[PDB]
């Protein structure tokens, strides 16, 4: 074909049923998350190419920085309850892999004070409930689907895709390319 498998993508041989139909797995302490957000802006292209009607998830991990990774991911969870995932996603990497100044809970707050969320809205957010299945719901579709690594996207559960299989010489181009398949897999 031009898109096989093994190649853009690979397939898992225990596909999940009811899974998010674009699903996307991150860490703050990952460093080419940090160049596919802040360099290639992966997520958002792959939005402007998916169809009508597709609904596009991502979700943090536990699997990098110990403590400050779980703290992280709790983070995530109340940013995806607010609805500010666009307004702390650049300056939680920044914090942990430019800056360094993310070395605590309290770090990580601060990011959401700065960006404009409120004390009060933050620390009750992190404390409900409504977080807690929602770190949940990001362990359990992690737990899923095999996830030892990251970047890692995977469609309806079925299809995961493999970006050491495409063109890194020019950055546009590996990002349509990315993109393109994820359209593909989409259609499949």
């Not at 402007?48 to 969870?77: C, I, R, S």
């Not at 949940?136 to 990251?150: F, I, P």
């Not at 493999?162 to 990315?178: A, E, H, L, R």
Request: net charge negative.
């Amino acid at each position: 074909a031009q898109y096989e498998d093994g190649k853009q993508y690979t397939t898992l041989e225990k596909p999940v049923a009811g899974a998010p139909q674009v699903l996307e797995f991150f860490s703050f302490f990952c460093p080419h998350c940090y160049q596919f957000e802040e360099v290639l802006h992966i997520s958002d292209n792959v939005k402007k190419k998916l169809p009508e009607g597709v609904k596009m998830t991502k979700y943090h991990v536990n699997f990098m920085g110990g403590d400050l990774g779980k703290d992280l991911t709790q983070a995530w969870a109340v940013a995806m309850a607010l609805g500010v995932e666009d307004k702390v996603t650049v300056p939680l990497f920044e914090g942990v892999q430019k800056t360094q100044t993310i070395r605590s809970a309290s770090d990580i707050r601060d990011v959401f004070i700065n960006a404009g969320i409120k004390g009060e809205e933050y620390d009750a957010a992190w404390n409900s409930f409504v977080v807690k299945s929602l770190v949940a719901q990001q362990e359990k579709a992690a737990a899923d689907v095999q996830l030892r690594g990251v970047p890692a996207m995977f469609v309806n559960g079925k299809y995961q895709l493999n970006p050491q299989g495409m063109d890194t010489s020019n950055m546009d181009v590996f990002v349509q390319q990315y993109a393109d398949t994820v359209k593909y897999l989409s259609e499949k």
